[PDB]
Structure formats: structure tokens, C-alpha cells
Amino acid sequence: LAQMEKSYLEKDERALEVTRTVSLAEVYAGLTENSFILKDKVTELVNAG
């Protein structure tokens, strides 16, 4: 346990925390293979489930 704690303290470093915002409208619109707009396909699939 002390060997593992020593290796943890010698290998733990800080970070680089990054948030990334992903909108599914941009992903589904720029997918280049059966790409679609989200707002009309959701009402197509909800009004006909």
C-alpha cells in the first residue's frame, strides 16, 4: 500500500479541465451521411412514433 501510495504521489499531477459544449443539431446537420435537421425530424418521429 505504501509503494502504491508513493507511485500515486509521484504520478499524480494537476489537470487540464475542459468543458466542451456539443449540440446535437450541429452534429446531426454536419454528419454527411443521412444528415438531417433535428427540429423537424423530432416532430416527424413524435407525431408518428
Binding site: 504521489l9 509521484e10 499524480d12 499531477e13 494537476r14
Partner: protein, 48 residues
């Protein structure tokens, strides 16, 4: 003598003394340990 027994008595020398037994606690030396390489932690001084 007339029977063949001596007039001047024989020698009875001193035997060997009991010795004193000796031993010794001989000693050795291993040196001190070489001080390792220091590693900077991520925590502040009270935690580490």
C-alpha cells in the same frame, strides 16, 4: 637396595595448568544509506 628398589626417589614434575578460555565479539560496519532523489508532490505542506 638388596631387593632392587631405588634409594633416590623419582621425579614427579608439575603437570600443565588449566588454561583460561578466550573468545571475542568481532565487529563489522555497514555504512549509512545514500539519501534518495526528492520528488515534488502536488499537495501543500500540511497534507504531505
Amino acid at each position: 637396595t638388596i631387593d632392587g628398589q631405588p634409594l633416590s626417589l623419582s621425579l614427579y614434575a608439575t603437570p600443565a595448568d588449566p588454561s583460561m578460555l578466550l573468545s571475542a565479539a568481532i565487529t563489522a560496519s555497514q555504512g549509512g544509506g545514500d539519501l534518495p532523489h526528492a520528488v515534488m508532490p502536488m499537495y501543500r505542506f500540511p497534507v504531505i
